[PDB]
Design an enzyme around this catalytic site. Structure first.
Site, PDB file in Angstrom:
ATOM      1  CG  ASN A  70      -8.846   8.710   6.462  1.00 24.24           C
ATOM      2  OD1 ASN A  70      -8.653   9.076   7.628  1.00 24.24           O
ATOM      3  ND2 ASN A  70      -7.967   8.001   5.766  1.00 24.24           N
ATOM      4  CB  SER A 106       2.842   3.967  14.339  1.00 26.53           C
ATOM      5  OG  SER A 106       1.729   3.617  13.520  1.00 26.53           O
ATOM      6  NE  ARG A 161       7.322   2.562   8.069  1.00 28.39           N
ATOM      7  CZ  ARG A 161       7.499   3.367   9.123  1.00 28.39           C
ATOM      8  NH1 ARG A 161       6.630   4.348   9.407  1.00 28.39           N
ATOM      9  NH2 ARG A 161       8.559   3.155   9.916  1.00 28.39           N
ATOM     10  CE1 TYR A 179      -5.574   5.173   8.018  1.00 33.10           C
ATOM     11  CE2 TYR A 179      -3.662   6.161   9.106  1.00 33.10           C
ATOM     12  CZ  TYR A 179      -4.979   6.259   8.645  1.00 33.10           C
ATOM     13  OH  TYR A 179      -5.735   7.393   8.879  1.00 33.10           O
ATOM     14  CE1 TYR A 198       1.636   5.907   1.593  1.00 31.72           C
ATOM     15  CE2 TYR A 198       0.588   7.569   3.001  1.00 31.72           C
ATOM     16  CZ  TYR A 198       0.558   6.318   2.388  1.00 31.72           C
ATOM     17  OH  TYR A 198      -0.573   5.545   2.566  1.00 31.72           O
ATOM     18  CG  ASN A 204      14.142  -2.519  12.567  1.00 30.21           C
ATOM     19  OD1 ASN A 204      14.099  -2.876  13.743  1.00 30.21           O
ATOM     20  ND2 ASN A 204      14.627  -1.280  12.363  1.00 30.21           N
ATOM     21  CG  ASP A 248      -1.608   1.432   1.449  1.00 34.52           C
ATOM     22  OD1 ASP A 248      -0.994   2.367   2.005  1.00 34.52           O
ATOM     23  OD2 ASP A 248      -2.775   1.571   1.045  1.00 34.52           O
ATOM     24  CG  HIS A 264      -5.128   9.383   0.498  1.00 35.94           C
ATOM     25  ND1 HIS A 264      -3.843   9.363  -0.017  1.00 35.94           N
ATOM     26  CD2 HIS A 264      -4.995   8.977   1.781  1.00 35.94           C
ATOM     27  CE1 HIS A 264      -2.964   8.958   0.872  1.00 35.94           C
ATOM     28  NE2 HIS A 264      -3.651   8.721   1.966  1.00 35.94           N
ATOM     29  CG  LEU A 280       3.876  -8.481  12.010  1.00 29.85           C
ATOM     30  CD1 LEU A 280       4.127  -8.600  13.537  1.00 29.85           C
ATOM     31  CD2 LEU A 280       4.335  -7.135  11.525  1.00 29.85           C
ATOM     32  CE  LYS A 291      -3.931   4.693   0.701  1.00 27.17           C
ATOM     33  NZ  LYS A 291      -2.896   4.354   1.689  1.00 27.17           N
TER      34      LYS A 291
END
Length: 308
Positions: free
Chosen positions: A167, A221, A270, A216, A55, A273, A50, A117, A280, A84
């Site tokens: 959203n 985060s 996200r 998300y 961004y 690393n 995604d 978006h 996950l 988006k």
């Protein structure tokens, strides 16, 4: 409705992978060679990605996908890509530009999903957030139904495999789906959900209109997070959450995943690393008892960690 296996029904009779990955602002150490991080993602099974105009990673995320369809790991049908349409580009006679601008830059053949978006629409131009010299932003009135008319067209035009929103809430949602002569209905609604704002009310609504709540900030985060103000609530360090993920062993990221997956929600992780993208893939070697599910379907504040 239960998930946890690799793929799922989506409106259009098209199938989304159940656990996804996201792309954005980064880690100082190693920095913005994101190509590498998306490479330790498809080398693991990770097939749904995604991104957005805003961004932009596209040019260099597109490319790592467009390198595994070279190693001989992927074969396109196996890669699902969300992009988006942007708030500026919301004016109807131009939508498709954002799409092409999205597809040239990815070097991908087309996209798998394109989503709204924001309802928030600002004027067309070169700066993605044009504040009106100052104050807030210059915004102009284009229409939500209209951008959706201008979304369907493109699927029907072979340029992006399916369409969806983001959203939107129950009021902007219902409208999309209530307008004159709708054709291709909404698939996902990429709102933010997780144990502290896990919309039980969007779930008992999205699902009524077959809308698949993709989420998300599922794992909270926490690292850096350019919206931190409240000197308090780090959720993947929470009390209950660091208990149950010992009662079923290993630290609370995997339970943060597990729950949402288990509700029948398509999460976005996200990372960059390697290490935390690898704990996950374990999200399927675990299990969740209902007592616990309710001891988890309890944590909620209702604090939106991301804000408009």
């Amino acid at each position: 409705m239960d998930s946890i296996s690799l793929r799922v029904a989506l409106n259009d009779g098209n199938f989304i992978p159940v656990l996804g990955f996201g792309t954005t602002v980064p880690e100082k150490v190693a920095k913005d060679e994101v190509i590498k991080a998306t490479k330790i993602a498809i080398d693991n099974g990770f097939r749904h990605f995604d991104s957005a105009y805003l961004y932009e990673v596209e040019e260099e995320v597109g490319q790592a996908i467009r390198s595994k369809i070279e190693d001989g790991t992927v074969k396109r049908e196996d890669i699902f890509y969300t992009s988006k349409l942007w708030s500026t580009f919301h004016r109807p006679e131009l939508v498709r530009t954002c799409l092409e601008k999205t597809l040239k830059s990815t070097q991908l053949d087309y996209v798998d999903l394109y989503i709204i978006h924001f309802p928030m629409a600002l004027q067309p131009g070169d700066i993605f957030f044009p504040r009106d010299e100052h104050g807030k932003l210059l915004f102009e009135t284009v229409d939500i139904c209209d951008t959706w008319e201008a979304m369907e067209k493109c699927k029907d035009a072979g340029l992006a495999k399916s369409i969806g929103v983001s959203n939107f809430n129950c009021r902007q949602l219902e409208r999309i789906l209530n307008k004159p002569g709708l054709k291709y209905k909404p698939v996902c609604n990429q709102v933010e959900c997780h144990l502290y704002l896990n919309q039980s009310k969007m779930l008992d609504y999205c699902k009524s209109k077959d809308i698949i709540l993709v989420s998300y900030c599922t794992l909270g985060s926490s690292r850096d997070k350019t919206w931190v103000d409240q000197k308090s609530p780090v959720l993947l360090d929470d009390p209950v959450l660091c208990a149950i993920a010992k009662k079923y062993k290993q630290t609370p990221a995997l339970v943060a995943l597990r729950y949402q997956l288990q509700r029948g929600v398509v999460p976005l992780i996200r990372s960059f690393n390697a290490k935390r993208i690898k704990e996950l893939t374990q999200v399927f070697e675990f299990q969740l008892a209902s007592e616990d599910m309710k001891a988890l379907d309890g944590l909620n504040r209702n604090f939106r960690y991301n804000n408009a």
